Symmetry: none
Subunit: 532 residues, 3 copies
C-alpha cells in the first residue's frame, strides 16, 4: 500500500497555492496510518482526491471574436436569432469590461423558455466560441446547502458541493457552467441553497465560495456562469440581482423541421447508424408533429425520430435493400404506432355553446372554450369552472354591452331578466383569470343568446369596454406561437396591439392570417354566420 507516497507526490505535483499547500499538509496530518478504512484516512485521502483534481490556477486562453461567436451563433439552431442579439449584447459588455472591476456585479443572462429546446446548444456555442469548457451541474430541486456546499469532514459521508463535482470534472479555472432548474429550488431542511447561489452569483465571493467539506476557499474568477430555467414568476428576488431574463420563443413547425433536418435528423441517422438510408419527407415530419408529440421543445419529436431510427436500423439488420427508403406520411404508424393525437383540433363541427380562445402557460399554450347555459327563468349570472372575478366583471361588462346592444345584433331587449346564465369555463380553472378573453366570453354569450353555432377556427383574445372596445393586451408573442401550433389561421387580434403586430418575425404572420379588431361588432360576424 503506497497511498502515502502517491498522495505526497499528488500534493507536490498538482499545482496548489500556499494556503492550499497548508490544507494539504493538514490532510497529511490525517494521513500517516497503516490501514485503509479508518475514516480519518478515508475522508482525508478522498479529500486529496478531490483537491488534486479540482485544478488550481489552471486555465485556457479565450478567442474572443464576437463575430466568430456570431458565426458560432449561425450554428446549433436554425433559430430566429432574436435574443442571440441579446447574448451579443452581454458579450459586448464582456469584450469591453475586460479585467476591470469598473464593471462590478454583471448580470449573466439567465435562460427561461419552453423545455426541450436547445439550451445546452447555446451553452456549448458560447464555450466553443470562446474556447471555453462546457459543463452542466443540475442545481434545481435543491433545499440544502449541504447539497450546494459540502457535507462534513466530521461526518461519515463527507461530500463536497455539486459545484466541486463539476470542478473536479473541469481542468480549467475558466470554464462555462450551465446552471439548471433555477426557478425550481426549495428550502425546508438545513438551509437555503439560494444564498449559496447568491455567493457564487456574487462575483467576488465566488472566489471565496467555501464549502462545509472544504478548508481553503476556491477561486471562481474566470469561470463564466450561465443559468437556465423554464418558468418566470418563481424567481428568488435576491437572485434577481445579477441575472438577465432570456425568454426563449418556442419553435414553430417549419422552424422545428429546419432544426431537425439541418441538425437533428442527421444525428438520428447516425444514431440508427445509417449512412442515410431512410429518406424522410417533411410532410411526414409535419404528421409527426400532428399526432405524436405536443411540446415546443425537441424531445418527443426526437423520440419518434430515434424510434424510426431504431426500427429501420433493425430493418436494415434484417436485410439491406435500399439507401433510398423514402419515409412518407403513410408508413409513420408502422414506425410510430397508434396516433397519439387527432389530425384536427380546430374541427369542432361549429355549434352554439362554444368558445375558441388563446392562452398559454410558461411551458405550453392552450385554447379557451366556454359553456353558456341560457335557461328560461329570471336572469342571473353563474360562475363555474373556477372562475375569477376579473372574469366575472369582464363577462358582465360584455353582458351589459349586449344589454345596450340587443336588437343591434338581433336580440330581444329584456334578456337580462327572464333567462338565467350558467357560465362553465373549465379553463377558468387555468390560473390566469386575467382579462385575456373577454371578447371570447362575449362571443360565447352572444352564441348562446342567439342559440346559434359559434364557429370554428376563429381564435380571439383580449379586453373590451362596456361600450365595446378591443383594448391593448400583451403576451401576443406566445399566443401567436401557440395558435400557429394550434394551426388556427383566422386569428382575431386587437387593432390596438397592431403597433405590436409588426414587432414580430414575419414568418408567423405569413403562416397566420390576422382578423384585426377594434370594434366588438366585427367579431360578431366571425363566429356567427347565424347572427340571428
Amino acid at each position: 500500500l503506497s497511498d502515502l507516497e502517491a498522495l505526497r507526490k499528488k500534493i507536490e505535483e498538482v499545482g496548489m497555492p500556499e494556503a492550499v499547500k497548508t490544507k494539504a499538509l493538514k490532510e497529511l496530518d490525517r494521513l500517516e496510518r497503516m490501514q485503509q478504512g479508518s475514516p480519518e484516512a478515508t475522508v482525508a485521502r478522498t479529500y486529496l482526491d478531490w483537491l488534486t483534481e479540482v485544478p488550481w490556477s489552471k486555465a485556457d486562453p479565450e478567442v474572443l471574436d464576437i463575430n466568430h461567436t456570431r458565426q458560432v451563433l449561425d450554428e446549433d439552431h436554425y433559430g430566429l436569432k432574436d435574443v442571440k442579439e441579446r447574448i451579443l449584447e452581454y458579450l459586448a459588455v464582456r469584450q469591453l469590461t475586460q479585467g476591470l472591476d469598473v464593471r462590478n456585479k454583471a448580470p449573466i443572462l439567465v435562460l427561461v423558455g419552453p423545455p426541450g429546446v436547445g439550451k445546452t446548444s447555446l451553452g456549448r456555442s458560447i464555450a466553443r466560441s470562446m474556447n471555453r469548457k462546457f459543463h452542466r451541474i443540475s442545481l434545481g430541486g435543491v433545499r440544502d446547502e449541504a447539497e450546494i456546499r459540502g457535507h462534513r469532514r466530521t461526518y461519515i459521508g463527507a461530500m463536497p458541493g455539486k459545484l466541486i463535482h463539476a470542478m473536479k470534472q473541469v481542468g480549467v479555472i475558466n470554464p462555462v457552467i450551465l446552471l439548471d432548474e433555477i426557478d425550481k429550488m426549495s428550502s425546508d431542511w438545513r438551509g437555503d441553497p439560494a444564498s449559496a447561489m447568491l455567493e457564487v452569483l456574487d462575483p467576488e465571493q465566488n472566489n471565496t465560495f467555501t464549502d462545509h467539506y472544504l478548508d481553503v476557499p476556491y477561486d471562481l474568477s474566470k469561470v463564466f456562469f450561465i443559468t437556465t430555467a423554464n418558468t418566470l414568476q418563481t424567481i428568488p428576488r435576491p437572485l434577481l440581482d445579477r441575472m438577465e431574463v432570456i425568454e426563449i420563443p418556442g419553435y414553430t413547425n417549419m422552424e422545428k423541421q429546419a432544426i431537425a433536418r439541418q441538425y437533428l435528423w442527421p444525428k438520428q441517422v447516425r444514431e440508427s447508424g445509417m449512412e442515410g438510408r431512410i429518406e424522410v419527407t417533411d410532410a411526414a415530419i409535419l404528421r409527426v408533429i400532428s399526432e405524436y408529440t405536443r411540446e415546443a421543445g425537441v424531445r418527443g419529436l426526437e423520440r419518434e425520430l430515434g424510434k424510426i431510427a431504431r426500427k429501420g436500423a433493425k430493418f436494415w439488420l434484417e436485410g439491406a435493400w435500399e439507401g433510398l427508403r423514402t419515409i412518407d406520411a403513410s408508413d409513420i404508424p408502422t414506425y410510430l404506432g397508434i396516433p397519439r393525437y387527432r389530425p384536427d383540433k380546430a374541427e369542432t363541427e361549429p355549434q352554439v355553446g362554444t368558445a375558441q380562445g388563446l392562452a398559454w402557460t410558461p411551458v405550453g399554450g392552450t385554447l379557451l372554450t366556454i359553456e353558456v347555459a341560457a335557461v328560461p327563468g329570471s336572469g342571473k349570472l353563474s360562475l363555474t369552472g373556477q372562475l375569477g372575478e376579473v372574469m366575472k366583471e369582464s363577462a358582465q361588462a360584455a353582458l351589459t354591452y349586449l344589454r345596450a346592444h340587443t336588437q343591434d345584433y338581433g336580440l330581444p331587449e329584456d334578456f337580462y331578466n327572464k333567462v338565467d346564465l350558467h357560465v362553465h369555463v373549465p379553463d377558468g380553472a387555468t390560473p390566469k383569470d386575467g382579462p385575456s378573453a373577454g371578447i371570447t366570453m362575449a362571443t360565447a354569450i352572444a352564441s348562446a343568446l342567439s342559440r346559434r353555432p359559434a364557429r370554428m377556427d376563429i381564435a380571439m383574445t383580449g379586453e373590451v369596454s362596456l361600450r365595446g372596445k378591443v383594448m391593448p393586451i400583451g403576451g401576443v408573442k406566445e399566443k401567436l406561437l401557440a395558435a400557429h401550433q394550434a394551426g388556427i389561421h383566422k386569428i382575431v387580434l386587437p387593432k390596438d396591439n397592431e403597433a405590436q403586430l409588426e414587432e414580430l418575425p414575419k414568418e408567423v404572420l405569413e403562416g397566420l392570417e390576422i382578423k384585426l379588431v377594434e370594434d366588438v361588432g366585427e367579431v360578431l360576424e366571425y363566429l356567427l354566420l347565424p347572427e340571428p
Copy 2:
C-alpha cells in the same frame, strides 16, 4: 484541533460578556468529547464560529456636519428639498440627545413611498454622510421568529436570523442599517415577529438581544436603524405606533431628465466601460420618458438607459469610427423598438360615455377609466367593477345632483325612473380612501346620458355635494403627480384647495392648466366636448 484552539483565542480575546465566556467554554465542554463526533461537534464548532465572527466592542465614526450632509443630500438622486428637511431634523434631534439620553427614545421615520425613488440611494447618501457602514436586509414576507432567531443551540440545522448574519457580515457594533420593506413583512402563521419589529424599534429592548441560536444579550442600542417602505395601509397599527411616517412624493419628468443628464447615463457609461465614448441628447430622454414606460419613478427608464448603453457598446464594438459615439432622439426607436406610448396624450378621441379620474397609491398614480352602461331597464343603479358602497354614496350623491337638473344639462326628465344604470370603476375600491373622484363618476354619467363626447387631456377628481359643490380632497400634490407622470397639464382643481395649491414647487406647476372649480356645471362645461 489547533484551529479550534484558535477559535477559542478569537472568541476569548474579543471582549465578551462572561455569559459568552461561560457558554463558549461549555461548547468547549461539548468540543472536548465530540471532536469528529456527533453534530454536537458540528453545531458547537459552528457556534464558536459565530462567537468568533460576530463583532463585539467596535466603532465607526458618525455624522457631524449637517450642511456637508446637505451637500451630500444634494449629491443624491436629486436635490428635491422636501424630505432632507426631515432628515436634518432627525439628525439634529439625535445630536442634541447625543450624550445618550432617554430623549433618544423616538420613531426612526420610515421612508414610505412609490418605487423609482432610489430608495437605497437615500441611505447610501446617508452612509456617505455618516461615514458609517451601510447595510440592507430585504424585509418582505417575514412570518416567523424562526425567520428572525434560531430555535436550536444543539443539533446543527438551525441557524441565526438574517439580522445576525448581517452582524456577522460587518465587523462593527455600529453600522448604518437600512431597513427595507417594513410594510412587506407578513403576519401569516402563528409566530409572526411583529413585536420583534418593536424590539428592533425599541433601543433598550435590543441592547439586550439574542436569538435562539446564539444566546447572550447583544447590543443593538449602539446600532443605528432606519426603515423605509412603500404604502401605508398595510402597516400594523402597533407598528404604526412608536412610528412617524415619511411620505415620498414622485418626480417630475424634467426633474427626471436632470436625474438622467447629471447622473444616470454617466453611470450607465460607468458600467458599460465606455468612458468618453458615448453621446446622448436630452430630448432623446424626453422621448424616452414620454413614450416608453409610464412607470412612476426611474427604474424602467434607468433600464432603458442601460439597454441603449449596451447597444452603443455593441455598435462601438463594430469598430471604432469615433472617440465619441453620438446619438439623437431618432435612433432610440432602433434602440428601444416601436414606441410603447406617445408623448402627453391629448389625442384619445373624446368619449360619449367615459371619464378619467386621478389616483395615487404610494406605489404609483394613474387615471381611472370609468363607464356607465345606461341600459334602458327599470331605472336603477349598479356599481360595476365590483365596488364598495363608498362608490354607491359617491355616485348616488353626484347622481342626485344630476337629478337636480333633469333639463338643465340638455337631458330628459327621468333616467333613474326609466334606465338601469351600471357604473364601472377599473378598480374594486377607492384609491384615496373613500370619495375622492366623484366628479369623474358624474362626468361619465353626463357623458353616457348625453351620448356626447367627453374631453380628453382635462382630467378631474374630487368630492361632491348634493347641491353640486366641490368638497376638498387633500394630498392634491400627489394627484398632480399622477397628472404629470401621465403628462396631464390640464387639471381641474378645487377653488377650495387653491391655497393648498400654493404649497408646491413651481416645477410641479409648470404650465399646468388649473381650472379652479368649486362647482360642478363648471366642469360640465369643461369636460364634455360640447357643453351638452
Copy 3:
C-alpha cells in the same frame, strides 16, 4: 442533551402548582426522545416554554393609599381634579375590598372618552400611585378568542392568547393592565370574546381562567385591570356590567395651553435637547391651537410642538445667536406649515338648503353640515350615510310636522307626493344612538323645502318628537365643548337641558348664547336667516 438539562430543570426550579408540575413532568416523559428532527417536539419545546416562563403568584407591593395616590393624581393633564375622586372611590373600593381580595361585584371602571388625552398617562400615574408594573393592551378589530385563550393545541403551532402571552411578558400577578379598544369586539372568527372577558372579569373564575394551549386554567386574583373604551352604547351587555363610565371633558384652549406650558411644552423643550433654549410666546401657542390641529385629542398638539422643536433645533444648529430664543406668532407659519385652519370657522356664507349641526363620535363631539336634496320625483325619503332607522323616523317626524305645517312656514304640498327627499348625514350609526341631532336634519329639510337661507354659527342637535316637539337628550355637553372650541356662539337646546347647562362651565357658555326652546316652529325660526 444540553437542551434536555436546560428545558428539563425548569420543571424543578420554577415553582409550579401540582397539576401544573404534574403535566410538566408529563411533557417531560412524553418527551425525552429524539427531539430535534421532529416538529411535534419543537412545538412541545414551546409548550414547555410557556409553562416554564409564566409567573407563579409573584406580585407587586400592595399599598392602597388615597392621599399620596391623589398626589400622584395631581400630575394629571391640567389638574382636572374631578375624576381623581373617581379614582379614590375606586381606592375606596380597594379600601372596602374585604369579601373579595379584589372587589368585583363592584364597578371596575371602563373609561370611555377622547382617547389618549392622558388616559394612558392616567394609568401611568396609577402604576406610579400603586407602585405597580404597567402594560397596555389594545383590542381594535379583535374578534378571536385564541387571541384571548390558548389556541387549540390539537392544532400544531397553537399559541396562548394576546393577554396570556402578555402575562408571559409581565411577571407579577398584580399589574396595572390597560384594556384598550375593548369596544371593538364581535363574533366573526370563533365567538365573541366579550364573554371571554366576562369570564376573565368574573371574580371567582379568573383564578382558574381556562386556556387551551396551556390546558391548566390560568390564575387571576389581583391583576389590576383598568378598562378603557371610546363607545358606551355599543358595549355588549356582559362587558356592560361591574363597571361604570368615567369620562374627562374637553380641555379648553387655555386649559390645553396650560397642559402645554405646565407640562407638554417643557416636555418637548427637554425632548428637543434644547432645555431652556426655546421660548415661544403663548399667543403663538394659542394660534397653533386655533390654526394647525382641530382635535379633542392633545397629543397632536404636542406633535405640532415636536415639529416646532425640530425646526428650532435645526435653526439653533444652523446658528446659535442665543441659547434661549423667542418665538412669536410670526415664525409659526415658518416653523410650522401654513396654518391649516382658520381660527375663525364662521365664514361659510350661510346656506339655503343644508344645515350645520352638532354630532357625536367615539372620540367625542363635532359639527356636520347634513345635506338634503329635495329632488322632484315620486315623493320619497332617502337617508344616506348608511343611517339608523332612528334617523329615518325622526326624519319622518319632521315630515309629519311639515305635513301639519304646510302653509305655516311656506312649503310645497309635495315632499311626500311627487318630491323625493335625499338626505345625507356625513356619518352612520352615532354612538349617541337615537336622534342625536334630528332637529338639524329637520332644519336642512325646511332649508331645502321652504328655500330660505339658513345660518352658520348656530349649532343645534336633539330629537324631533312626533308630537311636533323636541325632546332632550344627554351627551350634548361635550358637543358644546366642541362648539366652544370651534368658536360657535348660538345654540338652540330644548328647555329641559337648561338643567344640563349646570355641570358645564359658564365660561364655556359665555360665547355660546343659548336658545332654550323645544318647539319645532321656533327652531324653524332660530336657525334660518329669515325666520319663516
